[PDB]
Design a protein around this nucleic acid. Structure first.
Lengths: 55, 56, 77, 67, 144, 100, 142, 19, 191, 141
RNA sequence: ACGAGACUCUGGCAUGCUAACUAGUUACGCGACCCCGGUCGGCGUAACUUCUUAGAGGGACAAGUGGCGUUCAGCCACCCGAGAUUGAGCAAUAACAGGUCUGUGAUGCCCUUAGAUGUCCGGGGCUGCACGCGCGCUACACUGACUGGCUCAGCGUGUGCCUACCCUACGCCGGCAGGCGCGGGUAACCCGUUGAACCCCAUUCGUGAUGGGGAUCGGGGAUUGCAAUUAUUC
């Protein structure tokens, strides 16, 4: 029963159901407004998104 | 009328060093830095290590 | 440095009632705090006695509040 | 502390050098003069130019200046 | 009225405990182990006794009615969710315990856990915390 | 035919340029044009730490986006206002057409 | 017939109190409620201050109808107290002789500057590393 | 079409498309 | 008709200041006379702008201390008004005169300064500025009423009332007069 | 000419409580003695007949704003939630007592149902509220 | 020449300008209650930007007056005045053996690679306690605690790609935690006029480890999830 017990674990909810869409890590995710990455990747690619640190 | 290039990494030795070559004018503070200079950073992979490029 | 733990009576005995009726309408400022201090009774008991004396008409009202009330004697003239 | 910088004093000196015949003692009139003749990217800088020009006109009206 | 009444009972001997008579009847009955502030208002609302009197001037028939409400609270229309001991593992009855059934039933439940050897019983036997909280930083009055 | 056009963008100066040009075009086309309704702008504030690891003075960024939305109302048929709206659109300005 | 109407506002922190001066009898109502009927009642004399300094005969020709929203309680009291005085000053300036406006304005600024000029004080922005705009978290050594 | 994301998410998606 | 700025129900006129050194620092007479002890603000901005504040407002502002009472201006105002009620009904004297005479009588007029290194006990006698006289007088009255009204059956409207009249007659049964004259004794002990 | 908007509410609510006790046709709930008014409350009210007072305050708030339902009544009577060691928060009221208040105020002819949401005062109920407001004004006068 | 300054954002005002059925005001009609006049965030529509929204421009500069100063840079007080020191952002050369290889398909070298240091499933652990230390929360009460009534905001966010998981008015049931058919919003329209708390008023309490304080612990009932026991939460 390798096929039916290989990934029968439900990852429907929880932290590991989502991941970073830049580098695929599961720590420090930003889910607000659907960015779906960690803080470092947003800080590195924040200029081309259009977010400016005016304040 | 102003430029600045910075390199850092393995420059003929074990311990990394940083060489700076500045000629011209260079604004460092205020919003003219946001719209008078262009900053690009790249990584160069050599055989003995990784080398960094910073051009303004 | 004497402690003297106060044990206030919950209701009036004989001497407290006429002591109040002869001395409390002969004082300048009447509040339940000073009535409880002078007559060694409870705070709410002093409030009930002062409400009874207000209904009797021997005490005039000055100001009412949820914290404390102010009472004074009648004019002797 | 309100101490003017060297660019304000240099610009005020050269604008009172090359232009004197259209200046006065009112701060608003030579403020508009400095707005019309000199291209200045801001308003506070032009305002400080106008104030220092007014002060320099008031001292030139009394006596000569070495700058 | 505000004068002390005759046979004003000072110390009330109810259910082999000591009860002061100088306290309010909604609060002087709360000194009995097993009964608290919230359930005291319901008892003096089922019985026709006002809340504006002290405990020291009440007499035998009203305190006897209150003791009947203590011992048998179910058929005086007290709601079933208001009780402290519900759905028993021994017999399955709704009851209110007043310090004797309370103390011996808590003791019997603790020895039941210690006999059944559940980890709640082992933690009660060792003298630790059972609700699952951190012991590393607190509980410094455990032992010397 | 009552028509509503929305001028939503990120930069504000090109937004003022295209809204002034659209209002001027509706003025010269002899059309009843309403004034530019300025909606309250929305600020995009998310804050994060500076350093990638966990050491240092606890310092944070304040990244900001401002999106401005404008409304122009007209009373006109469909094809002429399609011809007007499909002229000189900026890459940073998004226009969307709705009909009542 | 013509209508005499001026519409004057006033602020303390964020509360906006907009008055309405129309010709009529002597009555002041804020949010439909009279001046003696606004919580808290401790500042009843603070509410009744401008009509008491300017007299009841000066207010006898103008109906006052103020609505207010924003701010807290004391800010709303100060806003409506500012708005009543500023509305009477602007009404006399618009219609009545200017000299009586000057005489009321002199005694109004002589009592307190708050009754005509708004106070420029707002809450400063909170910063990181501290619970407020100025305070910081407690520092530990060793 | 049945998704209709809000106005903030559209600009976020466009900027991340550009990135 | 503004015939007189009646402080609720007390008249701000016919009040006598006895000391001439505190004449321009206590403002209760004919200019800074309000209906309430609560004004707007901008009074602690510059250096000496707090000398123009009404003295009852300064007492109300210094009434609130110890964490749980900060910002509660209405509650301190009604304590002040009730305290004025007991002061008027207790002596037959105008309550503003009792406030003025207590601050003059409870003001420490000579001070000792800590001088030297940290730990050494050396004091040098200096005199107290008239503004600081009023300042420590108000602070002493407030802390005396505060520590009188703590774990006691007597309310703060009465504890504040007994504290000023004992400072007004100089009976030295109050706490402000106690620290005032031990401070004068310490300043006198080494000059 | 005197209305509800120029009547002091503190005497008004107890006068309405006396009037609703005198009327006595409100079909009060059976569990009025054993109930807690909100989950942020700690004891029962000391007033044994608070139902008339709560219905009076509900009628006053329905005059002040219309279209309110059971959910708007829970927001009005909310307060601080003291969970002891926990920092305090804001907690709303209980839904069933507001439901019972509005069924009592509908069963007595004072309130009919507003269209599509909430409830609103009958003009006869407005007459009753204004008449007792004038009564309180005449008593104070 | 860099740095400071200069520059940008926000607050503080302008009854002047441009504009608004996704914001209102003022008038008019209808409707409801009362004693001839008051209230309506009730209904509907003739002007307007006084409130609100946000665009361009203006305004404060040591500008004036009186002093001090070599009478030069500047300083002090006052009048008219919304402000005569608002807060933040950016922030130079030089280096630290400062931290991050556990942010990355950024990375050199070394180790390991089928009885695996890759990967997956099931269970456990990161929470385990003689004790010490740091950041914090609640209190030690009567400037208070409980119970009723009165009454006032601003930043925000909201149906997501694999990705399923949104915010909620309204009706009934139940003490309550909660449950079902019903409507709106992909958003200045719906929650919402965000009936927030502290405060205000009126009872109860009376110096008593007390009606302060709610730790520890027993029994019962709901929600989330495949799963709660070392109590998820209520």
């Amino acid at each position: 029963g390798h096929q039916q017990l290989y990934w029968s674990h439900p990852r429907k909810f929880g932290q590991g159901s989502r991941s970073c869409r830049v580098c695929s890590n599961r720590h420090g995710l930003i889910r607000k407004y659907g960015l779906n990455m960690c803080r470092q990747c947003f800080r590195q690619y924040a200029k081309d998104i259009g977010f400016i640190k005016l304040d | 009328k102003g430029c600045e290039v910075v390199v850092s990494g393995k420059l003929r030795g074990q311990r990394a060093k940083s060489m700076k070559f500045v000629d011209g004018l260079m604004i460092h503070s205020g919003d003219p830095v946001n719209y008078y200079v262009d900053t690009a950073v790249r990584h160069v992979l050599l055989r003995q290590g990784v080398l960094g490029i910073k051009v303004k | 440095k004497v402690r003297d733990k106060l044990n206030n009576l919950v209701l009036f005995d004989k001497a407290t009632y006429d002591k109040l009726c002869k001395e409390v309408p002969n004082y300048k400022l009447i509040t339940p705090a000073v009535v409880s201090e002078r007559l060694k009774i409870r705070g709410s008991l002093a409030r009930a006695a002062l409400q009874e004396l207000l209904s009797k008409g021997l005490i005039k009202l000055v100001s009412k509040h949820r914290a404390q009330v102010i009472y004074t004697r009648n004019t002797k003239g | 502390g309100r101490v003017r910088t060297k660019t304000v004093k240099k610009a005020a000196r050269v604008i009172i050098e090359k232009y004197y015949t259209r200046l006065g003692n009112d701060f608003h009139t030579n403020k508009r003069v400095c707005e019309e003749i000199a291209i200045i990217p801001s308003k506070k800088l032009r305002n400080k130019i106008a104030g220092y020009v007014t002060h320099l006109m008031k001292r030139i009206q009394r006596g000569p200046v070495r700058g | 009225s505000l004068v002390i009444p005759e046979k004003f009972q000072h110390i009330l001997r109810v259910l082999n405990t000591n009860i002061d008579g100088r306290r309010k009847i909604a609060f002087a009955i709360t000194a009995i182990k097993g009964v608290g502030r919230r359930y005291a208002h319901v008892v003096l609302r089922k019985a026709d006794i006002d809340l504006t009197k002290r405990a020291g001037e009440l007499t035998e028939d009203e305190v006897e009615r209150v003791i009947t409400i203590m011992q048998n609270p179910r058929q005086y229309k007290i709601p079933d969710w208001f009780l402290n001991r519900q759905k028993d593992v021994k017999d399955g009855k709704y009851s209110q315990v007043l310090a004797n059934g309370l103390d011996n039933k808590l003791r019997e439940d603790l020895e039941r856990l210690k006999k059944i050897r559940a980890h709640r019983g082992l933690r009660h036997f060792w003298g630790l915390r059972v609700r699952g909280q951190h012991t590393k930083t607190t509980g410094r009055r455990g032992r010397t | 035919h009552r028509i509503r056009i929305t001028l939503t963008s990120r930069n504000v100066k090109s937004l003022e340029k295209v809204c002034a040009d659209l209002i001027r075009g509706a003025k010269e086309k002899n059309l009843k044009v309403k004034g530019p309704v300025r909606m309250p702008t929305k600020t995009l504030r998310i804050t994060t730490r500076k350093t990638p690891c966990g050491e240092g003075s606890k310092t944070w960024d304040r990244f900001q986006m401002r999106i401005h939305k404008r409304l122009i109302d007209l009373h006109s048929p469909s094809e002429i206002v399609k011809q007007i709206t499909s002229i000189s659109i900026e890459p940073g300005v998004e226009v969307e057409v709705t009909i009542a | 017939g013509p209508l005499q109407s001026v519409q004057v506002f006033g602020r303390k922190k964020t509360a906006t109190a907009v008055a309405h001066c129309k010709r009529g009898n002597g009555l002041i109502k804020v949010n439909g409620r009279p001046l003696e009927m606004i919580e808290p009642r401790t500042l009843q004399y603070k509410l009744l201050e401008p009509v008491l300094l300017l007299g009841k005969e000066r207010f006898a020709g103008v109906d006052i109808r103020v609505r207010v929203k924003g701010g807290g309680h004391v800010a709303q009291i100060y806003a409506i107290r500012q708005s009543i005085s500023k509305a009477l000053v602007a009404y006399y300036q618009k219609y009545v002789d200017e000299a009586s406006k000057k005489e009321i304005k002199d005694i109004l600024i002589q009592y307190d500057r708050t009754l005509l000029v708004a106070d420029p004080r707002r809450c400063e922005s909170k910063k990181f590393g501290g619970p407020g705009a100025r305070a910081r978290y407690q520092k530990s050594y060793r | 079409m049945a998704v209709q994301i809000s106005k903030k998410r559209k600009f976020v998606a466009d900027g991340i498309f550009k990135a | 008709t503004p015939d007189i700025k009646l402080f609720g129900k007390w008249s701000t006129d016919d009040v006598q200041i006895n000391d001439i050194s505190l004449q321009d620092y206590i403002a209760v007479k004919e200019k800074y006379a309000k209906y309430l002890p609560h004004s707007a603000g901008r009074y602690a901005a510059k250096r000496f702008r707090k000398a123009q504040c009404p003295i009852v407002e300064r007492l109300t502002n210094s009434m609130m201390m110890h964490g749980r009472n900060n910002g509660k201006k209405l509650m301190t105002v009604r304590i002040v008004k009730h305290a004025f009620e007991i002061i008027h009904l207790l002596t037959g004297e105008n309550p503003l005169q009792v406030l003025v005479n207590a601050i003059i009588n409870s003001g420490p007029r000579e001070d000792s300064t800590r001088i030297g290194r940290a730990g050494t006990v050396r004091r040098q006698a200096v005199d107290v500025s008239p503004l600081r006289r009023v300042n420590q007088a108000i602070w002493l009255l407030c802390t005396g009423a505060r520590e009188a009204a703590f774990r006691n059956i007597k309310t703060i409207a009465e504890c504040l009332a007994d504290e000023l009249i004992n400072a007004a007659k100089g009976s030295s049964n109050s706490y402000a007069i106690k620290k005032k004259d031990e401070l004068e004794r310490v300043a006198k002990s080494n000059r | 000419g005197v209305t509800v908007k120029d009547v002091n509410q503190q005497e008004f609510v107890r006068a309405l409580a006396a009037f609703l006790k005198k009327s006595g046709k409100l079909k009060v709930p059976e569990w009025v003695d054993t109930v807690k008014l909100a989950k942020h409350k700690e004891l029962a009210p000391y007033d044994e007949n608070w139902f008339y007072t709560r219905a009076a305050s509900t009628a006053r708030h329905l005059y002040l704003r219309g279209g309110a339902g059971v959910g708007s009544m829970t927001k009005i009577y909310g307060g601080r939630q003291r969970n002891g060691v926990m920092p305090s928060h804001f907690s709303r009221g209980s839904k069933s007592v507001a439901r019972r208040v509005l069924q009592a105020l509908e069963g007595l002819k004072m309130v009919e149902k507003d269209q599509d949401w909430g409830r609103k005062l009958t003009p006869q109920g407005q007459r009753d509220l204004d008449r007792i407001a004038g009564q309180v004004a005449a008593a104070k006068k």
